[PDB]
């Protein structure tokens, strides 16, 4: 049922009125919004912005410190050990005690060295003892620390400690001297870093990546400095515990040449805490900035740099810990991009320079560099086009102050590069190429590298280089304290502008729109946040001209949106996305989760309402918005999400029916527009004269790339109302359309709330600036203020895209009506937030006298709008298009919008951006970023899955293999399972490290190909199959021992309760690891006990395959989902408390579950060996093992078989780069889904039966389907489905789910998973051509 909502009565909007308005508008001069790229213009823009930056900022004469850790290396670095730490610390203290301190930091260092070197033998024994054998001493109260009180502290040291415990200038970027000094310093550091200290995939890796990348960088100073930095950051992390951070610590490295002093500090477990440390090193080549050192002590022919006190937080510490891996993966990505651009491997000097640059960027994590590279990502396209908004981007380069030498150096390089690129465009000339399927005239002009003296053939290599640089910075830098405040002020500024417009014109005009006659009378109404009602209606008519031919499809799509389906039974409504909660007693808006709000509603309700019913029950509630705590993003409340879902469902249903013409979802619309444009340009124009003669006019094209659909804080949602009122749908009534209009009306006004963090920051300002004064004045009660028009980045993308398409069609009709005699062209295409506009204009073939005479005569004959057509007609085309878009509330961005002629590189970049949305380097670096902390097996699986996802995003298999190796090495380091460390399974399990199951610390190192095809768990499956075969054939003892290990893991799993689900069924046992959740701090996690939840899960088995629809079962199901360890870990990902477990993992504490106790991983291994030694196989165990080996894991072994049965050979042909395209990695009797059939099988209750009936598409066939499949299991494999255990084992074998992976490939590849695998095998070499031998389908 749909309640009767009020509709909108149509207005008498006339297209000819808009045509007359455009006639008047085009009769005068208009300003083009973009600037010509000239080289001199870019240089002058840089100089003027330098002068302005000098004006706005107070001057600093001393560049700030940018190196968090200062050190030097002259010899190959050996990783630190406890014995090496002791020896190096003794030698280092002996070295330091001979020196004469000058500065207070030097005095503190001397005092610390004296205290450490005078600790007793028991103190030294307990200083390096593990937590198990540690015994507290008077001086040593924590394992790796000691005590240093004021009795032995000097006066200078004590004063310095007291000072430690208890306006924004900028460098003079306009000075050539400041640039010269910064360039000199950074050049010296980079040269120091570059110095040298003194399977088929396996073969390709050893010949290419090992030879040209790994062997080159293995000897560089950067490699060993990175390992030394990893050791230092490990010490700093180990000191960050609650008990240990209050004491002092001393560590040493490189035979005493590097010394770390750790001072008492607040623990990193609690948020907003810093570790303080001082690094003392021998002066030499490395990460040395002598001008920023605290002091330089002199010894006989030697120097010791003592740094100032460094305070580092948890995120910066983790980034510095993984800096070496980040730099190596960035350099490997650069390696692959270089081989793609040039077709050859880079030389040693270029790889060394790239690696040094990447390492310097990765160790120096600051927001200024990240913002600079973010801006460069769009600055590079802005100087390679004909027209762009590069002055605005160069201005954006100067928003924050310049503080360090590194910032000045990067800016100087960027200015040089951009001026060089802009000066390249002056050699533009017309030529001939083969675009799409035509020979067309293109206007082309050597792109220098940014870190080496390499020149690319394409500027997309430059763009990807800058992108990889930008992703070297942690995503935790965004947000911080400047971005949150900035987004708050931007929102409040746009709301204040909306209020000013309301005061000037009245609330009705800003909400309902202005009329065309008012626009003619005032001419200032054409702006952002205001729209013309006539323009909205006419754009709706223009879109209706396309929609009226597909009315049936649009209607069927809308009714296919399932408006009567229960709201909270859908996945998107029970997710962990993030949602605003309730207004608390103190008056703030709560940051909450979608599932938590779902449980809050159901617990206070008696039914699971549908979307329309939920909208009617919450209609009267006000929309509320907030900034997300830490994850510039907004979160809204449940009624706001419901209204946005109504609007977006309606408009997605409508917009999917024009996806092949205007809105690319794939690239068909853009290719069609390009084909039409190129076909049009092939012809010639003949303008008819009054004297029956003709003028010959030549056709040319201009392309504009713009982000027109992207959400803007300056916008008015109310326009959509009239749009919705006039858009044609096939429905016979207006109830659904009226409901959409009503939802739009209810989303108009929002309560935007300040955050607690920002409020505290404001209260700590101590000096309220005028903009801060206005921002605080925006909130009457100090908590929330009303916002209108702006929908706060809510999901309305399909509506905005459809609206933009309608306005572009309106412009197309208006321009056709303006020049009936002229034969002009216009074609546009939308893809996500991007849009490509193609204008086809006319130029005189001759000198142009006849054309000028014709234009003058047309002007004299009263057609005054021909003034805009005399020269540069495409400019007037774009001006009128932009003005018409502004008649809605669409402003084409002055920045980030590029204008080009026909150009192969421009179109290639646009199509590449359309095909791929995420660079694979982002996923590659996020693999090292952080781990879920759920144990060895889970962390390994997560890292491997991220590497496979990166491979799906276009990463070469060699780069992905290197990333897999690095991630596996890091996980083994964290859990101690690698050889030589205390958690190595080979010391307890009496089997080989490769014969050990992964949950028991086994060797998880696997090929990237098998991980991508077979999956992220096939090591255990292969081990089980081999052990079963060996025992069943030869009855060997070792195979029985491996089976016993698997049975021990299975018993471990049975000890715990993991109901799981069809999509996450597990059969190989897993060690249960300690997860220090906030003890279920979640609000509604305490509704039902774990025992009650386990009983419910056992009783209701059908709900393990489908989702309940009734309120009670849904509430219990959602509580159970809340109580999932994996969901708990994800819901506390950004909590600063997690590191405790990491430390407990590194200290090898009692973090594993065994016999209802918390024990060490070593104790788990000992129990595993004890169980496996006495284990004897039974009939039930052998039967089960056969079901898993031959049936459950059957699909994965098949991909392995195909992998092992393939043959590839090198063809004497150079590799050819191709356009990248997305494909689907997807690998009949039963007409219902397997989850529905199985739930029907297990349905015993009326509620469960009804739930499966609603879930199933064809309920009537359900039983029949079950029957036939119940035959197959008892016919193809001879197993009894009637047993629930057998059903659970066989269900994931019969479930052909997932495969919804999207893989980026080249053009030739097909959509078959076998084709994707064959393409991956052909891309196993970065230079050579690989041909597969079978040349047929060899996958079962």
Author numbering: 226 to 391, 401 to 432, 449 to 695, 700 to 885, 893 to 926, 931 to 1492, 1497 to 1609
Sentences from the paper on this structure:
Hantaan virus is a dangerous human pathogen whose segmented negative-stranded RNA genome is replicated and transcribed by a virally-encoded multi-functional polymerase. It catalyzes two fundamental steps of the viral cycle: replication that results in the duplication of the viral genome, and transcription that generates viral messenger RNA (mRNA). The interior of the core adopts a right-hand organization that is common to all RNA-dependent RNA polymerases (RdRp) and comprises a palm, a finger, and a thumb domains. The active site cavity is located in the core center at the intersection of four tunnels: the RNA template entry, the nucleotide entry, the template exit, and the product exit tunnels.
From this dataset, multiple structures of apo HTNV-L were obtained in different oligomeric states: (i) the structure of monomeric apo HTNV-L WT, determined at an overall resolution of 2.6 Å, exhibits a conserved architecture compared to the previously obtained apo HTNV-LD97A8. The polymerase core is clearly visible, whereas the ENDO and the C-terminal region are too flexible to be resolved. The overall resolution improvement, from 3.1 Å HTNV-LD97A to 2.6 Å in HTNV-LWT, results in a more accurate definition of several regions, notably a β-hairpin of the core-lobe region (residues 676–695) that, by analogy with other Bunyavirus polymerases, could be involved in the stabilization of the C-terminal region. The motif F is rather flexible and positions itself in the template entry tunnel, thereby closing it and confirming the inactive configuration of HTNV-L apo. Apo dimer and hexamer formation would prevent the large movements of the ENDO and the C-terminal region observed in HTNV-L monomers, thereby stabilizing the entire polymerase structure.
